[PDB]
């Protein structure tokens, strides 16, 4: 006998105590070991309702990542709400590790196993677990990096598609590599990312096909972001502690719907913080080759307003609300209380 409930969750990880990598240190102090023999239980003949858009798990993971980042990536200058904070800022070691979220006694996590599950409504194949799978707290905009894949078809997610103010999460079923590089000795801040364009265009082809199923077979057009700050108009993310800002115009160019695509990037020290309402200044990049190779696993889209009287829909890449990054992995779970 169970009902929807929110409770305070705990985490589990495979953090190495000896590692100075800042996620390992965090999890070492803040999580417990993973259960080497987790036990999923499948529930016959039970339908359960889910709502990825209103899920307290999402608020708890966000709290964790804000706390991880507050203790490990301190800027030299923090400008948060009418104040200024000069403070030390050494270069650190940085590479996200999977984190599991688990329920305490009296509770359990239900997991939606339906393979087309769009994140809202009823779920036919529901099971129960002590813990979610391990989720890398990857902070980025525009493209979801190193997450999980949709198991069958590309899946379109949104709290309400008819409403264009609401972000769309596209869940890929086949990842595409993005190889990102700040080459060593010029412009220390200069970088690029490379993507196999044959792969990428075949995927963007399939996404347009999918979007037409939700938008009445209208014509699907991709465009670069309108305005907003740099963290949004570009694919922004963190690579070995460096904040990379990448121009995705070539990713979102409806024409090619074939070779290596080279996105130009710039490392920035001054940034608008994702944790909200404030800019921070970080230290200049470490020397040497700086490289992250990442799996693109989702896309974040914002749809254009005012296209009702045409046969077009226009999608621009978006993001900015990091809560949605965690929703893209947490959509398949809801906490319930047992009695």
Ligand X SMILES: NC(=[NH2+])NC[C@H]1Cc2ccccc2[C@@H]1NC(=O)C(=O)Nc1ccc(Cl)c(F)c1
Ligand Y SMILES: *[C@@H]1O[C@H](CO)[C@@H](O)[C@H](O)[C@H]1NC(C)=O
Q: Which residues of this chain interact with ligand X, rule CB under 6 A?
A: 139-141, 231-232, 236-238, 243, 271-274, 276-278, 320-321
**Footprint of ligand Y on 145-204 (CB under 6 A):** 145-146, 153-154, 156-158, 160-163, 173-174, 179, 181, 194, 196, 198-199
Q: Given the complex with ligand X, which of 231 and 313 has the nearer CB atom?
A: 231
Shortest CB 320 distance to ligand X, Å: 2
Which residue, 208 or 269, is less far from ligand Y as judged by CB? Answer: 208
Residue 321 binds: one of ligand X, ligand Y, none (C-beta under 5 to 8 A by kind): ligand X
Which one of ligand Y, ligand X, none is in contact with 276 (Cβ closer than 5 to 8 A by kind)?
ligand X
Structure tokens at 122: 């009823």
The verdict on 247 binding ligand Y (CB under 6 A) reads yes
Contacted entry of ligand Y, ligand X, none for residue 13, CB cut-off 5 to 8 Å set by kind? none
Q: Does 141 bind ligand Y (CB under 6 A)?
A: no
161 binds, among ligand Y, ligand X, none (CB under 5 to 8 A by kind): ligand Y
Which structure tokens are listed for 288? 């040497």
CB contact at 8 A, 297 and 144: yes
174 binds, among ligand Y, ligand X, none (CB under 5 to 8 A by kind): ligand Y
State which of positions 31-70 bind ligand Y (CB under 6 A): none
Least Å from the CB of residue 246 to ligand Y: 9
CA separation for the pair 314, 221 (Å, rounded): 5
Asked if 271 contacts 278 with a C-beta cutoff of 8 angstroms, the reply is: no
Which of ligand Y, ligand X, none does 272 bind, CB closer than 5 to 8 A by kind? ligand X
132 touches ligand Y by CB under 6 A: no
Closest approach of ligand Y to the CB of residue 281, in Å = 20
CB of 237 to ligand Y, least distance (A): 5
Partner whose binding site includes residue 292, from ligand X, ligand Y, none (CB under 5 to 8 Å by kind): ligand Y
Residue owning tokens 């979801």: 144
Q: Which stretch binds ligand Y (CB under 6 A): 6-14, 74-82, 207-215, 270-278?
A: 207-215
Question: Which positions touch ligand Y (CB under 6 A)?
Answer: 95-96, 118, 120-121, 138, 145-146, 153-154, 156-158, 160-163, 173-174, 179, 181, 194, 196, 198-199, 206, 210, 213-214, 216-217, 233-234, 237, 239, 247, 249, 292-294
């Amino acid at each position: 006998v169970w009902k929807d409930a929110d409770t305070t969750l705990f985490c589990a990880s495979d953090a190495k105590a000896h590692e100075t990598e800042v996620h390992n240190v965090w999890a070492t102090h803040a999580c417990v070991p993973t259960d080497p023999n987790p036990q999923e239980i499948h529930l016959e003949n039970v339908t359960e309702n889910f709502n990825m858009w209103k899920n307290n798990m999402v608020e708890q993971m966000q709290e964790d990542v804000i706390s991880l980042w507050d203790q490990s990536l301190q800027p030299c200058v923090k400008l948060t709400g009418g104040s200024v904070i000069k403070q030390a800022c050494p270069k650190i070691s940085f590479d996200p590790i999977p984190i599991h979220y688990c329920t305490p006694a009296g509770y359990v996590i239900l997991k939606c196993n339906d393979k087309n599950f769009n994140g809202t409504g009823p779920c036919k194949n529901v099971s129960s677990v002590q813990c979610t799978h391990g989720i890398k707290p990857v902070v980025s905009t525009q493209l979801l990096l190193n997450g999980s894949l949709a198991e069958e078809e590309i899946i379109i997610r949104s709290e309400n598609l008819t409403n264009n103010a609401k972000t769309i999460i596209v869940h890929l079923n086949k990842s595409v590599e993005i190889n990102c590089t700040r080459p060593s000795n010029g412009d220390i801040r200069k970088a690029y990312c490379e993507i196999n364009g044959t792969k990428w265009n075949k995927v963007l082809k399939q996404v347009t096909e999918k979007l037409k199923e939700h938008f009445n077979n209208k014509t699907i057009i991709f465009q670069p972001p309108s305005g907003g700050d740099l963290e949004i108009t570009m694919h922004s993310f963190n690579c070995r502690g460096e904040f990379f800002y990448c121009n995705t115009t070539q990713l979102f160019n409806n024409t090619c719907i074939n070779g290596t695509i080279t996105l130009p990037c710039k490392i920035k020290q001054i940034i608008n913080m994702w944790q909200g309402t404030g800019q921070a200044m970080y230290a200049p990049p470490i020397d040497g080759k700086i490289n992250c190779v990442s799996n693109i696993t989702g896309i974040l889209l914002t749809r254009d307003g005012g296209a009702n009287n045409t046969s077009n829909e226009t999608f621009r890449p978006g993001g900015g609300n990091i809560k949605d990054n965690w929703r893209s992995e947490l959509y398949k779970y809801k906490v319930v209380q047992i009695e």
